[PDB]
Amino acid sequence: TAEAGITGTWYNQLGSTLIVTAGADGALTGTYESAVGNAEGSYVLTGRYDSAPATDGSGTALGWTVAWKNNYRNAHSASTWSGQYVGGAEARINTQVLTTSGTTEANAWKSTLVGHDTFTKVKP
Numbered sequence: 105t106a107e108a109g110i111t112g113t114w115y116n117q118l119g120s121t122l123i124v125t126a127g128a129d130g131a132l133t134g135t136y137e138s139a140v141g142n143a144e145g146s147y148v149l150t151g152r153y154d155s156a157p158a159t160d161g162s163g164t165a166l167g168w169t170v171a172w173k174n175n176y177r178n179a180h181s182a183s184t185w186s187g188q189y190v191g192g193a194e195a196r197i198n199t200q201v202l203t204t205s206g207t208t209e210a211n212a213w214k215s216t217l218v219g220h221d222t223f224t225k226v227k228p
Contacts, residue, residue, distance in 0.1 A: 106126065106153060106154065106155060106156075106157050106164045106189065107126045107127070107128060107155065109126075109164070109189060109191045109195065110124060110126035110132070110153060110164070110166070110189050110197075111124065111125050111126045112124070112225070113225070114197055114223035114224065114225060115223060115224055115225070115226065115227045115228060116139075116221040116222060116223050116224075116228075117221065117222050117228055118138075118139045118140050118221070119139035119140075119227075119228070120136065120137060120138045120139045120140070120221070121136070121137045121139075122134065122135075122136055122149070122197075122223060123135050123136075123146075124149065124151075124168070126153055126155075128155065129155060130152050130153055130154070130155045131150075131151075131152065132149070132150060132151035132152060132153055132166065132168050133149070133150055134149045135147060135148060135149055136148075136149045136170045138170075138172075141172070141179065141203075142172065142177060142179035142181070143172055143177065143179065144174075144176040144177050145174055145175065145176045145177075146174065147170045147171070147172060147173070147174045148170070148171070148174070149168050149169070149170050150168060150169060151166060151167050151168025151169060151185075152166065152167060152168075153165065153166035153167075153189070154166065162188075163188030163189055163190045163198070164188055164189040164190075164191075165187075165188050166186075166187060166188065166189055166197070167184060167185060167186045167187070168184070168185055169182060169183065169184045169185075170182065170183050179205070180205060180206040181203060181204060181205040181206065182203070182204055183201055183202065183203040183204075184201065184202050185199040185200070185201045185221060186199060186200055186201075186202075187199030187200060194224075195224070195225055196222060196223060196224060197222075197223040198220075198222055198223075199220065199221045199222070199223070200218065200219070200220045200221075201217075201218070201219050201220065201221050202216055202217070202218055203216065203217040203218075203219070204216045204217075
């Protein structure tokens with residue numbers, strides 16, 4: 105199942121660590137530790153996934169958010185990852201990620217970064 109495949113620890117191409125539980129209903133809950141940026145320690149993560157994906161070889165759609173405030177630091181920013189889980193022997197979560205920082209109105213045009221993160225079950 106998608107639930108079974110997604111739950112656990114994942115690692116992106118930058119050295120960041122995702123620990124997530126996929127609930128029976130569609131919930132994603134866990135923590136995120138970033139190897140980059142104004143970030144230290146782990147941050148709360150919450151999101152959603154399709155709990156009944158197609159069975160035709162298509163991936164499982166999902167997304168999650170981390171606000172970059174925890175017991176260590178507050179970066180006044182939040183990231184969202186949107187993507188799909190791909191199961192099997194070389195399982196992946198392939199994502200694109202938006203990172204929005206709080207800005208003044210004048211600076212809103214430069215508030216949001218776009219990037220792409222690929223997550224694997226073993227460290228890169």
